[PDB]
Amino acid sequence: ERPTFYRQELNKTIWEVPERYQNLSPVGSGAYGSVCAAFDTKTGLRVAVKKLSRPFQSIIHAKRTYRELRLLKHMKHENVIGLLDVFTPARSLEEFNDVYLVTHLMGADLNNIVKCQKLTDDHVQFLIYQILRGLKYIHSADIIHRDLKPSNLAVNEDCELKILDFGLARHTDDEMTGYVATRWYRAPEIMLNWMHYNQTVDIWSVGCIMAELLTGRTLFPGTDHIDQLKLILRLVGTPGAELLKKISSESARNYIQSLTQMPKMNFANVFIGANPLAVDLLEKMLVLDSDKRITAAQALAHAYFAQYHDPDDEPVADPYDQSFESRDLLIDEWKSLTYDEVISFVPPP
Numbered sequence: 001e002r003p004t005f006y007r008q009e010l011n012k013t014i015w016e017v018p019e020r021y022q023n024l025s026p027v028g029s030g031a032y033g034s035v036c037a038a039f040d041t042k043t044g045l046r047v048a049v050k051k052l053s054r055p056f057q058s059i060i061h062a063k064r065t066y067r068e069l070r071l072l073k074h075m076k077h078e079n080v081i082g083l084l085d086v087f088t089p090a091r092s093l094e095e096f097n098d099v100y101l102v103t104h105l106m107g108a109d110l111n112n113i114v115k116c117q118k119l120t121d122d123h124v125q126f127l128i129y130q131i132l133r134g135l136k137y138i139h140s141a142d143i144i145h146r147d148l149k150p151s152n153l154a155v156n157e158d159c160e161l162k163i164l165d166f167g168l169a170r171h172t173d174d175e176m177t178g179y180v181a182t183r184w185y186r187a188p189e190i191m192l193n194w195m196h197y198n199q200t201v202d203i204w205s206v207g208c209i210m211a212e213l214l215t216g217r218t219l220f221p222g223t224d225h226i227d228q229l230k231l232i233l234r235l236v237g238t239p240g241a242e243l244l245k246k247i248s249s250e251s252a253r254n255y256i257q258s259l260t261q262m263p264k265m266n267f268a269n270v271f272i273g274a275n276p277l278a279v280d281l282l283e284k285m286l287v288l289d290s291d292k293r294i295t296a297a298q299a300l301a302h303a304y305f306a307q308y309h310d311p312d313d314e315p316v317a318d319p320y321d322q323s324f325e326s327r328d329l330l331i332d333e334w335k336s337l338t339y340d341e342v343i344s345f346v347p348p349p
């Protein structure tokens with residue numbers, strides 16, 4: 001059963017959407033496409049509709065279209081962005097060229113709310129609790145976000161939060177260059193490619209966000225990769241012998257050994273006037289050795305979140321089958337898989 005579609009010129013392309021979506025209004029740019037706010041008459045929600053630009057122009061584009069759709073289809077959690085709807089105006093695979101993704105529309109990102117509001121300890125508690133609640137779900141699906149930062153955290157007027165942009169990564173070298181927020185939240189082991197990284201990369205990012213919400217200052221605003229590393233090692237100390245042998249890169253080790261050794265600073269002296277429970281948790285997130293960082297599940301049970309923590313209401317996901325990532329296919333083959341995923345989608349209740 002196919003819905004009725006209507007056409008409309010938005011930005012500089014013709015959007016063709018089911019009738020249920022009304023009053024479409026451009027709200028900027030999303031991951032690989034333009035986004036319109038809309039009113040979903042069927043659910044009563046203000047939604048975000050993303051039209052993918054050129055979804056199948058190359059192999060890399062065709063696979064990432066498939067990748068984003070698979071990712072969104074998998075996530076069913078309050079604190080994680082998920083798929084309300086997905087559609088194409090096409091009546092067959094032969095004419096199938098456009099993909100539209102529909103998600104919840106949270107009013108703004110974390111950057112926006114910090115701009116307009118001065119947040120209390122309770123706001124911080126609630127915001128970080130939701131990030132960790134969502135992250136536990138994401139990690140339980142064996143997915144690494146790897147780009148957690150304020151611009152990827154969608155927040156509404158009620159202080160409710162959803163995580164965006166998980167599992168895509170690959171911000172270009174130039175986008176990560178210099179005095180840029182794109183790199184400030186990144187774990188040092190990923191930033192300088194020290195090793196095969198794990199999901200505690202995201203915990204480092206949470207630590208950087210939490211510190212910023214408490215202090216009102218970027219934690220590690222490096223002017224480049226090396227300046228940032230120096231800022232990081234000043235706070236958390238230089239690597240010890242144990243971590244050094246975990247760094248698989250021989251040049252990276254050689255560089256680390258050249259650095260003057262520094263102890264970890266006293267976090268209570270850095271974050272003066274902060275809840276001692278917040279400082280304790282921050283100490284456990286911002287650990288240089290990624291193996292020794294607190295997990296999202298462990299963090300949820302920390303005393304800092306006592307007023308929010310409910311072990312019966314912190315769900316996990318099914319495993320996410322990522323086998324397609326090692327698969328090499330033609331454009332038409334990625335396109336066919338994407339089509340199947342579009343037509344097989346069953347809406348949430």
Ligand SMILES: CCn1c(=O)c(-c2cc(C(=O)NC3CC3)ccc2C)cc2nnc(-c3c(F)cccc3Cl)n21
Nearest residue numbers: 030035048050068071103105106108109154164165166
């Ligand atoms: C326009 C920015 N924005 C979005 O791009 C999305 C969105 C995000 C994703 C997404 O995270 N995809 C990756 C696979 C995880 C997919 C589709 C959409 C429509 C949700 C979303 N919710 N709120 C916003 C939003 C907004 F609408 C205005 C200002 C700031 C923000 Cl964060 N967005």
